[PDB]
Design a protein around this ligand. Structure first.
Ligand SMILES: CC(C)(COP(=O)(O)OP(=O)(O)OC[C@H]1O[C@@H](n2cnc3c(N)ncnc32)[C@H](O)[C@@H]1OP(=O)(O)O)[C@@H](O)C(=O)NCCC(=O)NCCS
Ligand SMILES: CCNC(=N)NC(=O)Nc1c(CC)cccc1CC
Ligand SMILES: [Mn+2]
Ligand SMILES: [Mn+2]
Lengths: 75, 218
């Protein structure tokens, strides 16, 4: 999950348009991520990981670690 | 009334909106831990929209009260009050009502602009993309579709406490400033009624889309 955690962090700064390291337990809403950006991020994970990921998971797992571990169980 | 929200909801529901962050605003103490670790943009939009909500609340007689967030982030309104808040770049809006007159309300704000690449495919049914192409030109129907779907969810959740996916609602946009939301899943309400169709309204002005849905008391 650690290898994917840093992989989502790269994708998050691409939608957030930033270059700061992201704490893995900070909710992404506190970083400015909104509904439209969450849809953007979801489509970029679907592309980078080649798996169908529902949109409701981005907010069910609102941290990088919560998202990363939930994604490896989808492998 | 040249205000966006006040132009698509009945006068029975007081609303308030701001297009900038006025200097000196602050959150109530019970609201600070909600934004104690958020960045500057998230802090400003949080504080400004709750100022508009409390101003609209005092029209209904409600005094200064914190507005916290529930399990799925929904605003926790005082007992008997139903409301909705929205914030995008250049807009912060809020509308409230008494449940003795309306059961729910939702509003959403988006910049009048084409959706980012790849988003329209993941939020629109195949029948919706075909309908959007048949609509008259000169209006970003794609994002009006997205913003109207957020408004569909914002009115749906408070009467349901259940998830509604973008594929679960069929929105038909009319150019005359109205639209309908056809729910494709079972719409069991906490009241016991079934929620199958919503009636909505929209407006484009000052580079902003604003959609709003009010349910009636029946
Ligand atoms: O994203 P938008 O800015 O378009 O709407 C945001 C608002 O929707 C409201 N909202 C969030 N989740 C919601 C839900 N599940 N149901 C209803 N309204 C909700 C919140 O008040 C949010 O403003 P806040 O996040 O500052 O509390
Ligand atoms: C009709 C179906 N449309 C929706 N379900 N739309 C939302 O859930 N949008 C949303 C999301 C999901 C990206 C997260 C946080 C806040 C919001 C808006 C309140
Ligand atoms: Mn917002
Ligand atoms: Mn929105």
């Amino acid at each position: 999950p650690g290898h994917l955690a840093s992989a989502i962090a790269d994708e998050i700064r691409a939608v957030l348009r930033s270059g700061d390291p992201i704490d893995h337990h900070r909710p992404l809403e506190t970083l400015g991520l909104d509904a439209l950006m969450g849809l953007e991020l979801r489509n970029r994970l679907e592309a980078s990981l080649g798996i169908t990921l529902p949109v409701a998971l981005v907010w069910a797992y609102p941290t990088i670690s919560d998202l990363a571990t939930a994604l490896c169980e989808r492998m | 009334t040249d205000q966006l929200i006040a132009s698509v909801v009945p006068e029975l529901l007081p609303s308030a909106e701001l297009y900038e962050d006025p200097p000196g605003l602050e959150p109530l103490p019970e609201e600070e831990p909600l934004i104690a670790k958020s960045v500057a943009k998230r802090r400003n939009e949080f504080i400004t929209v709750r100022y508009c909500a409390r101003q609209a609340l005092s029209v209904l007689g409600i005094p200064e009260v914190p507005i916290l967030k529930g399990d799925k982030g929904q605003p926790l309104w005082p007992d008997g009050i139903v409301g909705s808040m929205t914030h995008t770049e250049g807009f912060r809006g809020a509308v409230v009502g008494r449940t003795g007159e309306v059961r729910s309300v939702g509003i959403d704000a988006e910049p009048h602009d084409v959706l980012p690449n790849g988003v329209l495919k993941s939020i629109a049914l195949p029948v919706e993309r075909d309908e959007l192409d048949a609509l008259p030109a000169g209006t970003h129907w794609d994002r009006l579709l997205f913003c109207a779907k957020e408004t569909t969810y914002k009115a749906w959740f408070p009467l349901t406490a259940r998830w509604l996916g973008f594929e679960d609602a069929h929105i038909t946009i009319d150019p005359d400033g109205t639209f309908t939301s056809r729910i494709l899943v079972d719409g069991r309400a906490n009241d016991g009624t079934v929620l199958s169709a919503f009636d909505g309204r929209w407006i484009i002005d000052k580079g902003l889309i604003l959609t709003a849905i009010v349910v009636p008391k029946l």
